[PDB]
Design a protein around this ligand. Sequence first.
Ligand SMILES: Nc1ncnc2c1ncn2[C@@H]1O[C@H](COP(=O)(O)OP(=O)(O)O)[C@@H](O)[C@H]1O
Ligand SMILES: [Mg+2]
Length: 415
Amino acid sequence: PKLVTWMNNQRVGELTKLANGAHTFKYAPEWLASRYARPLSLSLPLQRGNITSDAVFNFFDNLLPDSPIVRDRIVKRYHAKSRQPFDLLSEIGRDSVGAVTLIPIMAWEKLTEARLEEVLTAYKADIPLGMIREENDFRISVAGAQEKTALLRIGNDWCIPKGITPTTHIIKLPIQSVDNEYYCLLLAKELGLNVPDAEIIKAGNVRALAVERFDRRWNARRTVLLRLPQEDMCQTFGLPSSVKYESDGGPGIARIMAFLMGSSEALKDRYDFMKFQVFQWLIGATQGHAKNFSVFIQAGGSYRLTPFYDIISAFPVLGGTGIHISDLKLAMGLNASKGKKTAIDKIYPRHFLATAKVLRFPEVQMHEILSDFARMIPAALDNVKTSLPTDFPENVVTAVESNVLRLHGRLSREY
Ligand SMILES: Nc1ncnc2c1ncn2[C@@H]1O[C@H](COP(=O)(O)OP(=O)(O)O)[C@@H](O)[C@H]1O
Ligand SMILES: [Mg+2]
C-alpha cells in the first residue's frame, strides 16, 4: 500500500500506488527542511506535496532489472501483487543502485564455498538476482539485462546482507562475457580512465565477475557501510528504460554534454565523457546507451559524473555468429559531414573533432585525447596482457588487441 523511502538513516519520503494505479511520491517535510537535502532524482526536484508525473513511475521502474523475464522470475519468487514496479519493489526494494531504500543497520550471514556456489547458480532454477529460496531476508535489485546478483564482502568473506544492510559488489554470471569485461576494465584503468575495480571469483565450477560498487562507501574506520545517491541518465531525464538507446528516443552525446554543463565538475566531466567515447570506439563497445552513464547526486542537489562501467567489447563476438565488424555501431553517434557517423569500422579522428566543435568542447582538448591514445595504446595493451591470469581465454585477448591496434592505427598515422 505504501513504501517509505530512506537514504541510509534518514527518511526521504514515501512512494504510494493510488486507486487509479498511478505512482505518486511525496517528500517528507523533515527531509525538505533537513541540512543538505537533495532530490531522489534530478527529474523529481524537492517540493512539497504529491508528485504525479510519469517521472515517478519511470524513476523507480529504472531501479528494476530490465528483462521482462527476470521480472517474471521475481513475481513468482515473492508472489508480487503484480508486475508493476511498486509491487516488485515492495519485495526487493531494500537494496538498489544508489542510496534508495524502500520498505513498507549492520547484519548478515557468511557464505560457505557451497552456499556461495548456490547463489551464483540460482538463476539455473529461474531464481531472480540469485535470491535463493533458502533465504527470505535477501532483497536486492540491480538494473541491466545481464544476469547478475549483489553481495556484501566483509574482509575476505562473501556474505548475504540482512535487512537494510547494503551490498558492496555487483556480480555478473555467465549468461564469454566474464573474461571480456574483466579485460576491458583493466584496459580502461591502464589508460587512466575512471572505472571500478573488478576481480574474477571462482566458486567450484563457476566464473563470475565481482565489480566493486562506487555507490557504496565505508567510513574511514571501516565500521559503517553507507550508500551514495546516484542515478543513470534515463532517470535523470525522466525517461523510461525502454528508450535508453538514442535510436529509440534516448539521449545522445549532445544532450549529455549539455547536461554536464551543470555538473559541479563540468569541465572535467565533459572532458572524461568525450575521452570515453573515443575509448568505446577503440574497443568496439556498442552498448554505451543512457543507463550506462550515471551521476552522483551530492549535498544540495549538485551532481557529478560517476566512474564508467558495463564495458564490453563486441570484437570477441565477431565471426562466430555471422556478426561482421561492419555491423558494429556506437550507441551514440558522432557528427558526420551529413547526419551522423555510427559505424565503428568507418569512424576516424575527424568525426570526434567535428562533434567537439558543434558542442563547444575545446578543440585543443580533443586533440590531446586523440594523441594520448595514439601513443599510449600499444604499451597499455602490453601491460594488461601481462597482468592476465594464465588461465584467461586467449581468443578474447587476440580479437581485442588485433582489432584495437587496427583502429589505433588511425590515430598513430595522425599523431
Ligand atoms: N561499479 C558499480 N558501482 C555502482 N553501480 C554500478 C556499478 N556497475 C554497475 N552499476 C549499476 O548497476 C547497473 C547494472 O550493471 P551493468 O554493468 O550495467 O549491467 P548489464 O551489464 O546488466 O547492463 C547499472 O545500470 C548501474 O546503475
Ligand atoms: Mg546498464
